[PDB]
Amino acid sequence: QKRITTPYMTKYERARVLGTRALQIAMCAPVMVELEGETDPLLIAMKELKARKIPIIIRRYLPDGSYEDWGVDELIISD
Amino acid sequence: DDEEETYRLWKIRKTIMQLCHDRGYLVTQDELDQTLEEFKAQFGDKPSEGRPRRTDLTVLVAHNDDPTDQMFVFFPEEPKVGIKTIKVYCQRMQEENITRALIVVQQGMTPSAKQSLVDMAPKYILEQFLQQELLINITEHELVPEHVVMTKEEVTELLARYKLRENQLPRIQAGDPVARYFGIKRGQVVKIIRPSETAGRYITYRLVQ
Amino acid sequence: KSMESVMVKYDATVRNSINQVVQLRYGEDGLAGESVEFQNLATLKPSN
Amino acid sequence: DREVLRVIFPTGDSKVVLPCNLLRMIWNAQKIFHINPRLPSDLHPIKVVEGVKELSKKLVIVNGDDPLSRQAQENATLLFNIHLRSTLCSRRMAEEF
Amino acid sequence: QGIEQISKVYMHLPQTDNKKKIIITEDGEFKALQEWILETDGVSLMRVLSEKDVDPVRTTSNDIVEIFTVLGIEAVRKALERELYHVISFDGSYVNYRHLALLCDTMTCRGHLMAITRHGVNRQDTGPLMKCSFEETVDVLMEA
Hints:
- The structure is cut from a larger assembly and holds one copy of chain A, one copy of chain B and three copies of chain C.
- Chain A is an alpha+beta fold.
- Chain A is 34% helix and 13% strand.
- In chain A, strands 1-2 form a two-stranded antiparallel sheet.
- In chain A, a hairpin with a 5-residue loop joins strand 1 and strand 2.
- In chain A, helix 1 crosses helix 2.
- In chain B, the strands form three sheets. Chain B has a four-stranded mixed β-sheet.
- Chain B has two domains: 1-136, Dna-directed Rna Polymerases I, Ii, And Iii 27 Kd Polypeptide, Chain: A, domain 1; 137-209, RPB5-like RNA polymerase subunit (Eukaryotic RPB6 RNA polymerase subunit, Alpha-Beta Complex), CATH 3.90.940.
- Chain B starts with a helix and ends with a strand.
- By secondary structure, chain C is mainly beta.
- Helix content of chain C is 0%, strand content 23%.
- A three-stranded antiparallel β-sheet of chain C has the order 1-2-3, with no helix packed on it.
- Chain A binds chain C through residues 4-6, 60-64, 68, and chain C through 9-13, 15, 19.
- Chain B: Residues 136-208 form the RNA polymerase subunit H/Rpb5 C-terminal domain.
- Chain B: InterPro entries: Arch_Rpo5/euc_Rpb5, RNA_pol_Rpb5_N, RNA_pol_Rpb5_N_sf, RNA_pol_subH/Rpb5_C, RNA_pol_subH/Rpb5_CS, RPB5-like_sf.
């Protein structure tokens, strides 16, 4: 509640989320989506992003020092 | 020559009327649209050794919001305004209990009076204006966008809306010609409205510092 | 060197490292340059 | 809005840069929906006007209900709103598009 | 007779729309009147503006310092935008207006003409490490 940041996920947010989630998957993090014949952590992370199943929360820091916590599932993906 | 000098006096008077109107002091539409022939009808002589004199050209205006609050405009005849002249104006202002005065100056002013105005600034706010500067109203220039002095309440609302500090806003020097035109002091805010080729209109805020 | 830290912040304003506000909205409309393109205003030129 | 545009562009240069290409989007809609320019249309003018109004409400650059935010939004999307109204006017929609 | 600091004055009719005087006729159409505009090899903006029969609105100068000292910081912003756009578009090249606006806004942000050169950049207040990246790192750290 009381969120002023854009509801859409920025390109930088998408890039960092994909990279971090791919690193976790490569480090054997549980996969929130059902992968079929997929081994590349980046591809798995992209599948999770499309499914909106990535378990990551983005903390957007506003200029005034406050921050807003947005769920990846809550944000709107560009694709 | 006297014709050119009376044309000047008319031009400076017109610029002063526009300046007062912009500052918000009550000014009649006739005074704003006073033709050169109308000014020459009002005074009816040449400036040099004639009826229209800088002493007779002084202008008194009253603020629209507060009629009690008033502003003086003084034209000293001497080409170099002296401490005695500033003291005369100071005592005259004391008579009417008026705080704000625009001393339109000739080609120059004496440095001692330059510091005297600052010394007496708190009790009385005296602003020196060159006749050459006042010969043209710079606010009508195409480059200059629209400037509006924000009230303290409006500044508070702006800072609350953008969660900003006064330090974070863009700055405008108190010595800026437009800042002097509007008679804005340090700590005030100017809302600048300018057309935008991308958005159509854009509002900026500048803190007087 | 002058414009290194100038940035579009999460409040949609443009600010430098000092956090001073350079523009309230980037480009004065809050739009990225990639998406915009030229168009003609139909009501500007024609007569009354 | 025409007077506002006259003020904004005294030189009368109609070429402007705006996010959405309304003419190309209208052409795309015509091709997608097989709009026949010969037969009469079933698009109702007050539907056109109301859709333009609601779309203008939805195009938010500055969000907030306070007067300052509303004025900022209006100024931010002033030019695009003017172009949108001119392009999606009922007259043009019924006549050409 | 005449104004000092002005060596030569050229008078000519402009053949381009930008320098032509565009007005709105009674019918509402845009008419580009061909008017006499004169340029100078010197700069005295205050005097030239105060001169009679000289358009006090359209008359301008190509000197940013003169624009600053006469019209103000906002006029500097606008005129700097115009000059930078003129140099960019002289060869027919086009640059998005937002970049021009950002550069001019950064240059005029502090209320006074800030030179992009080190001379004006040093005026900007920045952390010690930022000033070190600029120049004079060792002495800046010494003072800090």
